[PDB]
Amino acid sequence: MGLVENIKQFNDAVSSVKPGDEIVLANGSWNDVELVLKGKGLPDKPITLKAQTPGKVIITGQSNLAFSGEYIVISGLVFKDGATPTGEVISFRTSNEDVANHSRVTNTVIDNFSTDLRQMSDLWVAMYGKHNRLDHNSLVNKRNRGVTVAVRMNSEASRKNHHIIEYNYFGPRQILGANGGETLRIGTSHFSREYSNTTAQYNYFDRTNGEHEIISNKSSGNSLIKNVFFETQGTLTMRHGHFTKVEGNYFLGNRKPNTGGIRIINESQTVSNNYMYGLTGKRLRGALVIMNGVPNSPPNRYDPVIDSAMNNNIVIDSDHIELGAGADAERSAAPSTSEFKGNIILGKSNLEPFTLYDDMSGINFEGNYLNDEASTPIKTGFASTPYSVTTNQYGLKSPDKALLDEIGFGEVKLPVTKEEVGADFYPKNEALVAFQSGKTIHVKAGTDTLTSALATSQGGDVLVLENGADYLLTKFAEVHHPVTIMAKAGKKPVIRSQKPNFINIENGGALEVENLWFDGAESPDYKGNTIIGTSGYSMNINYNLSVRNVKVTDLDVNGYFYFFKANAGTFADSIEIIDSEFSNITGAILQLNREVDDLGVYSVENLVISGNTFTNVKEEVVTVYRGGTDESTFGPMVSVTNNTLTNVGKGSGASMYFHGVQKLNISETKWDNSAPLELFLTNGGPITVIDNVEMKNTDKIRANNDEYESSNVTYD
């Protein structure tokens, strides 16, 4: 009815609207626009805001959309490469009192509508009101904190909403390094006993790894049904609220790390007829979890599990069923009047898949099946059955037909596929370029030849330097995309710089270095120099750093000269230091700074330090620190093997410091006249094994509790 091409025209057409009329945004870029629409349509005659050509109306910059009234439809829009100036990108309200009812947002894309600051939280879709629908939308590349889709519950007008959220595509969500990266949140703790009655169904969660809670259910009466979770880190958690129905969901973990399933807390939960495959998560992130709760819990803790059922689920090739998880002096109430019946557990990666943290007498176990090779400590309710798992018609590892029929599961088949969800006009393209997937480029010896070669390289490229040759930098060597810098086998080239940082990983960058020699003879006379650094600003794209067969010498022109220094506000999916040699360094090897707001922030997910020698380093090799009390979130995972530290950390101090690491493995490593190893084991169960280490002329391991396992610790 009304085609508009500028904000002025838009605001005129929506100043007065009647049932049936539509406002069309003409194709093109809509930059820095705050779209507001109020009106009252009709069941047969909605008020529609639509794109001229779905995929060709690009809302960008500092933009958002807020609407209120009745029977509004919003379709075909794209929000790409911007950030909302409010708290919400698409909002089903226009003020605290004016909400949308019986309205719909469909066939719409939000693509990287992320703040440049990774620590700032917003909501991408905020649902208010009653009887709203959110369907067939694509939400991709959320790089900051916050919830992608939230159902709000802060007033009566938004409770008992019966919203429907369905057929949406939730694309990859990088690990945040902090709390609050849920994909779907239904309610909040402050209104958690209130009823929402939301249905989320037929959605596809694709590597939505923001945090441990993929779906944070925080209100009563919801149905989370018939969704697909593909290699998703974290769980579907019934965090607060009762009378949740969780059925027909398929978790395709594929043996990826930290892949969890369904966590029951609180009352009258039904978790049945779900399918799980290849889930590796443990404890609060296990494939199936039933928590202990706090008697007379405050609304923000954990209600004891009562009147709940966990039945007729299929759990294949998964590792952890955790009953009573969280049990302690506070969470002292074990599950009661609940049942665990008719489940099929077929896995061989963990032959003792159950952990019981408390008395499970309050749970009636009946009719379950567990593969011959595995055992349960529960005396009743389980029958052993052979491990028979065959890929079926729809490409899914399935139990035998006779067991399926015995529990009335039906076919093992996805309730929805990747191809049936999201906007119909927007591709689902990978956004990450792999190391060495591009061209090999020669870098001749000399001054700023590496600088120039990087400036024109592309993601995936490999810069190959001349063996034994000299390289000098007088400018920053900036890495704007995944790149490899290396020499083929033979004599290491030597790299020097007159700048305070040799190489900086910029936002979007990631770096492999192999068979290089970095030396400090040309470095400037400043404190805080480093060989490799991050960008110096918040980087809302996680980076990666791989260092293999590298030699680093004479970082001593001034104090605090580090090998690698990540500034506050950056996050590394993986840092690997392999088979490398470091000598005469006044700083730390790895300086992993943090921007402390949430005390739970951490700056690296996976750290591997293996095959190295560290000699005459005044500061530590690495401090890995996560504060706060979140037992539930990830921790860094750290592996330290086959290294030698000679005169490290003596410039009282420590040579390595690990604090709030959820998984720490140290082995085959010798300290020689170094500061001691320092540990701090946080509440929960941080897994910590230290085997075959020699502490020659080194003080005793510094720890807070004896809570770790240790074997073969020699003190010379």
Between 239 and 594, whose beta carbon lies closer to ligand V4W?
A: 239
User: What is the Cα–Cα distance from 531 to 698, expressed in whole angstroms?
Assistant: 28
User: What is the Cα–Cα distance from 15 to 464, expressed in whole angstroms?
Assistant: 62
Between 7 and 687, whose beta carbon lies closer to ligand V4W?
A: 687
| Position closest to ligand V4W via CB | 632
> Containing H/E element for 426?
none
Q: Exposed, middle or buried, 43 (CB in 10 Å: 0-12/13-18/19+)?
A: exposed
Least distance in angstroms from the C-beta of 703 to ligand V4W: 25
Site string for ligand V4W, 322-361 (x = CB under 6 A): ----------------------------------------
Between 210 and 353, whose beta carbon lies closer to ligand V4W?
A: 210
Told to check if 212 binds ligand V4W by CB under 6 A, we report yes
Q: Give the rounded distance of the alpha carbon of 611 from its chain centre.
A: 29
Reference 236, options 271, 192, 282, 196; nearest CA is 271
Least distance in angstroms from the C-beta of 182 to ligand V4W: 8
Q: What are phi and psi of 402, to 5 degrees?
A: -65, -35
User: What is the Cα–Cα distance from 340 to 289, expressed in whole angstroms?
Assistant: 12
CA distances, 61 to each of 49, 67, 398, 586 (Å): 19, 19, 47, 44
Least distance in angstroms from the C-beta of 309 to ligand V4W: 22
Least distance in angstroms from the C-beta of 143 to ligand V4W: 21
Between 514 and 630, whose beta carbon lies closer to ligand V4W?
A: 630
Binding-site member from 25, 105, 175, 284 for ligand V4W (CB under 6 A): 284
Reference 140, options 427, 419, 569; nearest CA is 427
Least distance in angstroms from the C-beta of 632 to ligand V4W: 3
Provide the residue type at 162 as one letter. Answer: H
Q: Tokens for 57?
A: 């109306």
Helix (H, G, I), strand (E, B) or coil at 421: coil
Least distance in angstroms from the C-beta of 366 to ligand V4W: 29
Looking only at the bridges linking them, the beta strands covering 390-391 and 397-398 are antiparallel
Between 152 and 212, whose beta carbon lies closer to ligand V4W?
A: 212
Reference 714, options 688, 691, 687; nearest CA is 691
Looking only at the bridges linking them, the beta strands covering 494-497 and 149-151 are unpaired
Reference 516, options 456, 443, 575, 566; nearest CA is 443
Between 118 and 212, whose beta carbon lies closer to ligand V4W?
A: 212
Least distance in angstroms from the C-beta of 371 to ligand V4W: 30
Least distance in angstroms from the C-beta of 562 to ligand V4W: 33
- Strand blocks (E) in 41-120: 47-51, 57-61, 64-70, 72-75, 78-82, 88-91, 100-101, 104-106, 109-111
User: What is the Cα–Cα distance from 149 to 227, expressed in whole angstroms?
Assistant: 15
User: What is the Cα–Cα distance from 513 to 552, expressed in whole angstroms?
Assistant: 12
Between 297 and 623, whose beta carbon lies closer to ligand V4W?
A: 297
Site string for ligand V4W, 239-258 (x = CB under 6 A): x-------------------
477 contacts 510 by C-beta, under 8 angstroms: no
Count of helices and strands (H, E) across the chain: 3, 70
User: What is the Cα–Cα distance from 177 to 635, expressed in whole angstroms?
Assistant: 8
Q: After which residues is the chain broken (C to N over 2.5 A)?
A: 651
Least distance in angstroms from the C-beta of 239 to ligand V4W: 6
Between 297 and 350, whose beta carbon lies closer to ligand V4W?
A: 297
Q: Tokens for 319?
A: 């590792």
Least distance in angstroms from the C-beta of 240 to ligand V4W: 9
Told to check if 632 binds ligand V4W by CB under 6 A, we report yes
Between 49 and 321, whose beta carbon lies closer to ligand V4W?
A: 321
Q: How far apart are the first and last CA of the chain?
A: 85
Least distance in angstroms from the C-beta of 56 to ligand V4W: 40
Site string for ligand V4W, 171-200 (x = CB under 6 A): --------x---------------------
Which residue carries 């946080």 as its tokens?
682
Between 236 and 588, whose beta carbon lies closer to ligand V4W?
A: 236
Between 207 and 301, whose beta carbon lies closer to ligand V4W?
A: 301
Told to check if 318 binds ligand V4W by CB under 6 A, we report no
Count the helix, strand and coil residues of the chain and give each as a percent rounded to the nearest 5.
5, 45, 50
> Residues touching ligand V4W: how many (CB under 6 A)?
7
Least distance in angstroms from the C-beta of 629 to ligand V4W: 7
Between 219 and 669, whose beta carbon lies closer to ligand V4W?
A: 219
- Scan residues 11-50 and list those touching ligand V4W (CB under 6 A): none
Between 515 and 632, whose beta carbon lies closer to ligand V4W?
A: 632
266 contacts 237 by C-beta, under 8 angstroms: no
Least distance in angstroms from the C-beta of 474 to ligand V4W: 48
Between 212 and 226, whose beta carbon lies closer to ligand V4W?
A: 212
Between 637 and 654, whose beta carbon lies closer to ligand V4W?
A: 637
Least distance in angstroms from the C-beta of 299 to ligand V4W: 11
Between 358 and 514, whose beta carbon lies closer to ligand V4W?
A: 358
Q: Tokens for 687?
A: 């897994």
Least distance in angstroms from the C-beta of 113 to ligand V4W: 24
Least distance in angstroms from the C-beta of 206 to ligand V4W: 21
User: Could you please report the per-residue DSSP string of 103-146?
Assistant: -EEES-EEE----SSTT-B-EEEEE-SSS-EEES-EEE---SBS
User: What is the Cα–Cα distance from 333 to 173, expressed in whole angstroms?
Assistant: 35
Helix (H, G, I), strand (E, B) or coil at 452: helix
Residues that bind ligand V4W (CB under 6 A): 179, 212-213, 239, 284, 630, 632
